[PDB]
Amino acid sequence: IVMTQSPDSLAVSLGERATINCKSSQSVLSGSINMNYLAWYQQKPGQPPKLLIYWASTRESGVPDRFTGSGSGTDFTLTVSSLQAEDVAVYYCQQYYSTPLTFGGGTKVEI
Amino acid sequence: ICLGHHAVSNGTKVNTLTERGVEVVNATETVERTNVPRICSKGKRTVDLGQCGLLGTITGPPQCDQFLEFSADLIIERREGSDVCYPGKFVNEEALRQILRESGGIDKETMGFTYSGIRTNGATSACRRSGSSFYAEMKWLLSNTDNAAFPQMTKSYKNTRRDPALIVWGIHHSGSTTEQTKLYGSGSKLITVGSSNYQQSFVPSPGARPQVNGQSGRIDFHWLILNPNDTVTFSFNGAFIAPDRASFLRGKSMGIQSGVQVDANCEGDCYHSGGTIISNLPFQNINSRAVGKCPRYVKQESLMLATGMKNVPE
Amino acid sequence: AGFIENGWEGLIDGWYGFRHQNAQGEGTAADYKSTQSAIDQITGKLNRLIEKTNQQFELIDNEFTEVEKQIGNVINWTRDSMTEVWSYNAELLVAMENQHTIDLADSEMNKLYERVRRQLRENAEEDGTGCFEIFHKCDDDCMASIRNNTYDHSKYREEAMQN
Amino acid sequence: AGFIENGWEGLIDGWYGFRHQNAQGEGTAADYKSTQSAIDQITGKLNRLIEKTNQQFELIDNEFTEVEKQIGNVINWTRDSMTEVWSYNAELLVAMENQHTIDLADSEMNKLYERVRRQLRENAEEDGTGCFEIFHKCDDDCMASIRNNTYDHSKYREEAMQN
Numbered sequence: 071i072v073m074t075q076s077p078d079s080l081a082v083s084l085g086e087r088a089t090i091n092c093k094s095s096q097s098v099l100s101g102s103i104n105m106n107y108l109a110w111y112q113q114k115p116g117q118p119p120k121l122l123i124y125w126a127s128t129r130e131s132g133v134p135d136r137f138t139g140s141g142s143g144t145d146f147t148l149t150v151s152s153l154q155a156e157d158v159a160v161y162y163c164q165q166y167y168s169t170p171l172t173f174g175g176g177t178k179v180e181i
Numbered sequence: 182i183c184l185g186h187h188a189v190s191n192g193t194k195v196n197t198l199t200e201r202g203v204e205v206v207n208a209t210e211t212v213e214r215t216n217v218p219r220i221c222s223k224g225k226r227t228v229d230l231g232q233c234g235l236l237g238t239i240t241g242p243p244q245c246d247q248f249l250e251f252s253a254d255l256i257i258e259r260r261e262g263s264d265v266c267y268p269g270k271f272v273n274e275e276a277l278r279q280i281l282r283e284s285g286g287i288d289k290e291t292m293g294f295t296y297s298g299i300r301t302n303g304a305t306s307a308c309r310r311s312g313s314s315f316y317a318e319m320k321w322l323l324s325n326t327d328n329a330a331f332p333q334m335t336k337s338y339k340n341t342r343r344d345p346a347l348i349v350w351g352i353h354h355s356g357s358t359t360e361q362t363k364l365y366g367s368g369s370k371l372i373t374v375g376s377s378n379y380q381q382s383f384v385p386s387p388g389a390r391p392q393v394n395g396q397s398g399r400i401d402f403h404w405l406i407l408n409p410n411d412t413v414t415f416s417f418n419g420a421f422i423a424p425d426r427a428s429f430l431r432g433k434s435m436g437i438q439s440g441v442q443v444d445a446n447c448e449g450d451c452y453h454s455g456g457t458i459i460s461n462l463p464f465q466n467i468n469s470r471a472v473g474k475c476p477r478y479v480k481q482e483s484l485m486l487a488t489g490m491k492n493v494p495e
Numbered sequence: 496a497g498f499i500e501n502g503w504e505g506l507i508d509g510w511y512g513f514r515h516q517n518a519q520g521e522g523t524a525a526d527y528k529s530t531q532s533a534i535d536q537i538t539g540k541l542n543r544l545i546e547k548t549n550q551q552f553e554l555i556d557n558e559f560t561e562v563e564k565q566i567g568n569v570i571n572w573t574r575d576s577m578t579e580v581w582s583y584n585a586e587l588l589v590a591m592e593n594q595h596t597i598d599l600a601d602s603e604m605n606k607l608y609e610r611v612r613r614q615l616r617e618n619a620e621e622d623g624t625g626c627f628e629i630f631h632k633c634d635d636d637c638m639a640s641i642r643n644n645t646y647d648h649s650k651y652r653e654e655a656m657q658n
Numbered sequence: 659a660g661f662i663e664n665g666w667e668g669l670i671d672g673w674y675g676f677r678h679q680n681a682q683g684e685g686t687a688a689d690y691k692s693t694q695s696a697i698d699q700i701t702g703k704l705n706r707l708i709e710k711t712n713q714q715f716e717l718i719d720n721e722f723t724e725v726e727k728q729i730g731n732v733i734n735w736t737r738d739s740m741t742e743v744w745s746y747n748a749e750l751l752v753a754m755e756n757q758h759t760i761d762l763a764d765s766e767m768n769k770l771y772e773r774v775r776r777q778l779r780e781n782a783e784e785d786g787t788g789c790f791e792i793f794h795k796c797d798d799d800c801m802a803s804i805r806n807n808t809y810d811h812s813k814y815r816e817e818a819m820q821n
């Protein structure tokens with residue numbers, strides 16, 4: 071299983087839509103749970119990559135509401151409604167339906 | 182000329198206001214008797230709980246490992262499905278079951294309940310995977326190492342989400358007072374649970390019980406619903422089963438309690454213990470407890486709606 | 496369908512038909528308008544009846560772990576009363592719609608009968624068994640003209656008044 | 659209302675009426691007895707239908723502070739089942755009384771039609787379009803006598819049998 075990602079760093083300003091796309095070689099959905107296994111991580115420079123959302127739709131406690139994850143069988147999306155200086159990081163989509171965990175290629179966001 | 186109508190040798194006997202059992206040239210079914218003995222529900226998300234119980238997905242016995250934070254528009258319960266590994270019972274059980282059946286699956290969001298001065302890795306021989314263990318999201322809060330005073334602890338969790346959280350916890354009534362002192366220490370333990378709409382409190386009551394699942398003590402599994410921007414406070418002196426992850430609703434589902442295997446071969450609408458009632462007919466005589474948008478129950482075995490005329494043989 | 500001795504068995508395509516037994520021979524044809532109207536009305540009644548419910552019901556009672564006995568009997572009694580009133584409504588509706596279907600068949604039948612009366616001023620009259628005694632002879636043309644609802648009576652009046 | 663090609667649009671005051679097309683000219687009149695009976699029957703049906711109920715229900719569920727979830731869901735399910743049965747009964751009642759009012763209008767038309775044919779033994783006959791072909795000449799007195807149910811057919815038989 072290979073984990074692709076979106077195009078390279080986006081030259082987006084503050085307070086606008088930010089879209090990151092993730093695509094999978096296989097299907098990471100269901101398993102009699104219908105819960106589409108996919109994690110999203112943001113990584114600040116010099117800080118460990120803290121998780122954003124888990125199973126691509128469950129927003130974590132310690133993250134803002136602006137991070138919205140849209141999921142499907144193969145395609146996945148992170149959308150940011152109003153990006154600011156606290157959201158600059160590099161983003162990874164990780165599959166964990168199958169045992170060889172492959173992270174995403176990294177999607178840096180640029181102000 | 183001679184003017185007349187049509188008739189057949191073998192028609193159908195139908196019920197009528199004036200006479201009962203009148204002979205008609207053709208008639209149609211009204212009450213649906215044909216039952217599909219399968220939960221065929223294609224086009225809808227479906228989880229088959231199996232050996233797992235609906236409440237167990239909230240609390241996490243070993244049989245409910247697979248469906249701990251599921252998400253589906255059709256929740257299927259089984260009679261073999263058990264809700265607990267360690268023996269116990271949920272208070273206000275059917276209210277929680279009906280909340281779970283209309284949840285669209287559940288999510289688990291961590292409480293951040295750090296604990297100092299106590300041992301939190303509860304271990305029971307009944308709730309077994311690789312040794313003496315406990316539930317998925319429950320910490321059985323024991324003493325430090327042996328008989329010792331459990332410190333009075335106040336832990337507050339604030340539901341910062343925009344949806345009402347489903348808070349759950351447990352109360353351990355030991356098999357004896359000596360066992361209660363072994364696990365939590367001496368003294369009369371008293372636990373209060375405070376919220377804006379929840380003020381119920383209680384005292385654990387050690388005592389001898391029949392050996393259910395190889396254990397004597399029982400866990401009363403209490404629960405509440407937290408509104409958005411609301412905090413719950415657990416003030417426990419001892420004998421507590423603290424939650425780890427608060428449960429959160431997802432959306433709208435429709436939960437069934439069936440006993441047949443699941444497939445995806447029908448655009449089914451309502452389901453019951455006997456299977457699925459696929460029909461456009463207005464009435465059915467299969468099960469009185471079918472839930473969903475489908476034909477409705479009647480007492481008559483079979484109703485004949487007259488489609489043709491009053492035929493008379495030639 | 497009351498004054499008729501029996502219904503025809505050879506009438507297959509149409510619900511309401513016609514027989515001639517004239518000098519040309521014997522023929523059994525089928526009317527189209529009356530049976531089309533009757534089937535349209537009855538199929539519309541069925542399509543009104545054949546309709547799955549929109550209202551969504553959830554599980555209120557647990558089959559495996561029995562609920563508290565007082566609220567359990569309350570649920571059982573409410574469901575039993577609803578089942579009884581639904582069985583009542585179903586049998587009442589089935590009885591009265593079978594009655595209305597039989598009455599609609601009779602109404603279409605004697606509507607065709609009375610329109611055949613209206614098409615035949617005095618060239619024909621009833622026998623009481625559902626047959627019309629034609630007082631003129633045609634080579635199976637006026638048979639279809641009665642059937643096609645394109646019958647002219649004024650040209651057949653002069654030879655049927657004196658008989 | 660079956661054999662009529664189309665209902666009249668110029669008739670306003672009543673429900674059932676008459677057209678003249680006689681030698682005096684063309685005129686439209688309105689019958690009074692049949693429309694009075696039809697409106698009386700339909701208004702009685704409305705009066706027995708348009709009635710606020712005597713039974714006075716009480717507030718069983720709380721809108722502001724939600725009641726206990728088990729008994730609350732029992733109340734919700736009972737109210738949903740009663741809503742479904744009341745909606746079904748309302749559709750049933752509306753459909754069957756609309757059918758009965760349509761059949762009542764058809765039967766009032768039929769009763770007026772048969773009473774007009776009963777008034778005029780052989781002086782007039784139907785054509786199939788809802789009209790009557792008068793076989794005698796009379797300047798609006800005979801026709802108003804037909805409307806007034808005072809028609810004396812005995813003095814018109816001699817000139818209508820030969821025609």
Ligand SMILES: *[C@@H]1O[C@H](CO)[C@@H](O)[C@H](O)[C@H]1NC(C)=O
Nearest residue numbers: 206207208209210488489507
């Ligand atoms: C008789 O009614 C049934 C409805 O159950 C229908 O399927 C069938 O086509 C009908 N047959 C005829 C000859 O009308």
Ligand SMILES: *[C@@H]1O[C@H](CO)[C@@H](O)[C@H](O)[C@H]1NC(C)=O
Nearest residue numbers: 340341342343408409410411
């Ligand atoms: C609770 O807090 C959230 C965000 O902190 C806020 O949007 C919400 O209005 C608060 N609740 C009330 C009742 O004010």
Ligand SMILES: *[C@@H]1O[C@H](CO)[C@@H](O)[C@H](O)[C@H]1NC(C)=O
Nearest residue numbers: 469470556564567568570571
């Ligand atoms: C309620 O009715 C169901 C059948 O629909 C039956 O199985 C159950 O035993 C009944 N409950 C009681 C308490 O009798």
Ligand SMILES: *[C@@H]1O[C@H](CO)[C@@H](O)[C@H](O)[C@H]1NC(C)=O
Nearest residue numbers: 719721727730731733734737
């Ligand atoms: C019961 O129905 C009312 C409206 O009829 C609705 O507002 C309420 O939420 C329902 N209760 C439950 C528990 O769904």
